[PDB]
Amino acid sequence: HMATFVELSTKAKMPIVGLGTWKSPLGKVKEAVKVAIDAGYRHIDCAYVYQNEHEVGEAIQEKIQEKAVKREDLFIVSKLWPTFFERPLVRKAFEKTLKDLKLSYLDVYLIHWPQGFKSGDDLFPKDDKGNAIGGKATFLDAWEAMEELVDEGLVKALGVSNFSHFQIEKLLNKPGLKYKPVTNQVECHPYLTQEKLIQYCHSKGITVTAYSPLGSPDRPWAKPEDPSLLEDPKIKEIAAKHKKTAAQVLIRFHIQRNVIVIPKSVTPARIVENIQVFDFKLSDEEMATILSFNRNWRACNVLQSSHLEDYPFNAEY
Ligand SMILES: NC(=O)c1ccc[n+]([C@@H]2O[C@H](COP(=O)([O-])OP(=O)(O)OC[C@H]3O[C@@H](n4cnc5c(N)ncnc54)[C@H](OP(=O)(O)O)[C@@H]3O)[C@@H](O)[C@H]2O)c1
Ligand SMILES: COc1ccc2c(C(=S)N(C)CC(=O)O)cccc2c1C(F)(F)F
């Protein structure tokens, strides 16, 4: 199935469902991407910190070599991790991502998190204790380096992730800004419906990409008492009606809000199921019901970074 597009401010077309790759093992992610491309996926969400981009790259190159897909029809997103915000490190980190992915360009390159981390060998540099150690460079510094990539044709568009509206304002207000973000990739699902942030982003011509749309049940820190979207009986009730799965309803929820969504799986049958979401529709009542489930609950609150200056989640939205 071909996912529907969401038009970006650049007029590029971003497929509304993509494949997530956080936690996808080296040993499984290459097959996951191959299965996804065969099943009609064109958008793949990647990151340097996921430490699996080289296997994603192998999958894409092989599919292009087998004439299963053309590069112009793929939509590949990656992200700049916050230990690489210093000018020279932006370029080096990008170059490693691009080399690993075996691509000539990225469709979108995101600021992964706004709050900067100390540069050095460690991906997760620690206080003592282990709250995050902050960095010298800020996301505004990083953005300027990222703009170079767009000028040089290495990236078609920039975006942000885990930004509050205040942080988007800071960016949009930056003197000498060359490129505006095309998306804000944030956690979004029926327990964190992001009404105000989505309103704000859309009002600025910025799309929203919903991460952890199934509640990230495989996040390492899940506790059995934590909210569970996939086992929510009211979600299951609405799925059963449609003869669909819970997952499919959780994905379709975003589509109907014109929000891009990136469910992760390495299980072939689930990869295929998760893009089977364009032949049913949730009713207005069903959408209103699911919207009403908001709990302000984050699977990814990253509280160890909450003392850093640009920690995003102290703002209302
Ligand atoms: N920008 C950011 O800061 C950030 C943060 C978090 C996530 N993300 C992105 O968003 C993607 C999605 O979020 P996520 O990985 O946190 O979690 P998710 O997509 O909400 O949930 C993934 C989990 O759901 C399972 N699953 C997938 N399809 C299913 C189905 N149809 N039925 C039952 N279980 C199913 C997967 O199992 P199997 O894989 O075993 O099948 C995996 O355990 C990430 O992979 C990443 O690309 C970005
Ligand atoms: C900005 O801080 C982050 C950001 C991401 C993480 C992750 C990752 S890689 N994810 C939540 C996935 C992602 O950011 O895409 C895992 C553990 C701690 C993190 C932390 C932190 F260590 F603080 F808790």
Curated annotation (Swiss-Prot):
Q: In which pathway does it act?
A: Cofactor metabolism; retinol metabolism
Keywords on this record? Acetylation, Lipid metabolism, Lysosome, NADP, Oxidoreductase, Secreted
Taken from the record, one Pfam family name reads: Aldo_ket_red
EC number in record = 1.1.1.300, 1.1.1.54
The places in or outside the cell where this protein is found are: Lysosome; Secreted
Please tell me, according to the UniProt entry, what happens when changing K126L. Increased affinity and reduced catalytic activity towards all-trans-retinaldehyde
| Expression triggers | Overexpressed in certain types of cancers, including hepatocellular carcinoma and lung cancer associated with tobacco smoking.
- State the remark under miscellaneous: Has no counterpart in murine and rat species.
PANTHER family under this entry?
ALDO/KETO REDUCTASE (PTHR11732)
Protein name as it appears in the record:
Aldo-keto reductase family 1 member B10
